[PDB]
């Protein structure tokens, strides 16, 4: 089964909100505690701003649904520690990946993403990931089993 | 005519802390209000880990010296609008740059950097920049 605390990166959050995922989204929000990094929220909004959506309004909706986690001092410190040792090993990941993974570790959330291997170098620091497609199938199974 | 509020991107801030800048830094903190994005300080701490391994202690030191601005919701929102506008023009600045510039606008701070051209496409949104070299010269004098 799946753990209670989970999170998504911007790409995954975009899909979770697509019209084809309406049902899966409803179940996920009803059964899980989703902790999103403000960074993930900002990047999601960039995609929404691209198609001229009302950002201010969509932000309130997200805030009214999710536990939006700020870039806390502890996250800033932890992220700097992870990035520095990774960099010391010629491993370079973009800022979004670092903050997203650091926040997942901090909130003890399973990071659902369509590209888990990209985050693989952060596992050693405590990060746990799961393929989005497997996550979706898991939730569907949950629905099938219900009374 | 330097303004009261200023900021730096991580690269510029790293130089401001060079041993050979102690004087310039002392005057700066003495005459200006420096508002740094939380993103800028994490990159700064990351880049100096080879010199100061105690990230936690280093963060506390910074928190006491500067005004550290969080990635507030309004900054998140505005950063999204700006990035979408740049992407439409096929301009791809990295996250740090977008948030640094967005925070500067939010705090009404002059962004001191070594690469102002990079940020130029954002001036239409209220951003104000100045070359680190000029800033250093402008500061050399009471």
UniProtKB/Swiss-Prot annotation, chain A:
Domain PINc: from-to ranges: 7-124
Top enzyme category: hydrolase
InterPro entries: PIN-like_dom_sf, PINc/VapC_TA_RNase, VapC_family, VapV_Thermo
Signal sequence extent: none
Record-linked SUPFAM superfamilies: PIN domain-like
Any GO molecular function: magnesium ion binding
Cofactor requirement: Mg(2+)
EC number assigned by the record: 3.1.-.-
Residues that hold Mg(2+) according to the record: 9, 97
Keyword line: Hydrolase, Magnesium, Metal-binding, Nuclease, Toxin-antitoxin system
S-S bonds: none
Keyword Metal-binding: yes
Gene3D superfamilies associated with the record: 5'-nuclease (3.40.50.1010)
Metal-binding in keyword set: yes
Function: Toxic component of a type II toxin-antitoxin (TA) system. An RNase.
Family of the protein in this entry: Belongs to the PINc/VapC protein family.
HAMAP family: VapC_Nob1
Subunit and partners: Homodimer.
Protein name: Ribonuclease VapC4
Chain's gene name: vapC4
């Amino acid at each position: 089964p799946l753990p209670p605390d989970i999170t998504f990166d911007s790409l995954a959050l975009i899909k979770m909100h697509s019209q084809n995922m309406k049902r899966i989204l409803e179940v996920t929000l009803a059964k899980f505690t989703v902790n999103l990094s403000i960074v993930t929220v900002y990047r999601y909004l960039t995609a929404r701003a691209y198609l001229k959506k009302n950002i201010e309004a969509e932000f309130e909706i997200l805030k009214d649904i999710y536990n939006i986690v700020p870039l806390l001092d502890d996250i800033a410190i932890k992220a700097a520690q992870i990035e520095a040792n990774l960099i010391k090993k010629e491993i370079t990941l973009d800022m979004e990946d670092i903050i997203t993974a650091t926040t997942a570790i901090y909130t003890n959330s399973l990071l659902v993403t369509d590209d888990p291997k990209r985050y693989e170098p952060i596992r050693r620091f405590g990060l746990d990931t799961m393929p989005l497609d497997k996550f979706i199938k898991e939730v569907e199974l949950m629905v099938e089993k219900e009374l």
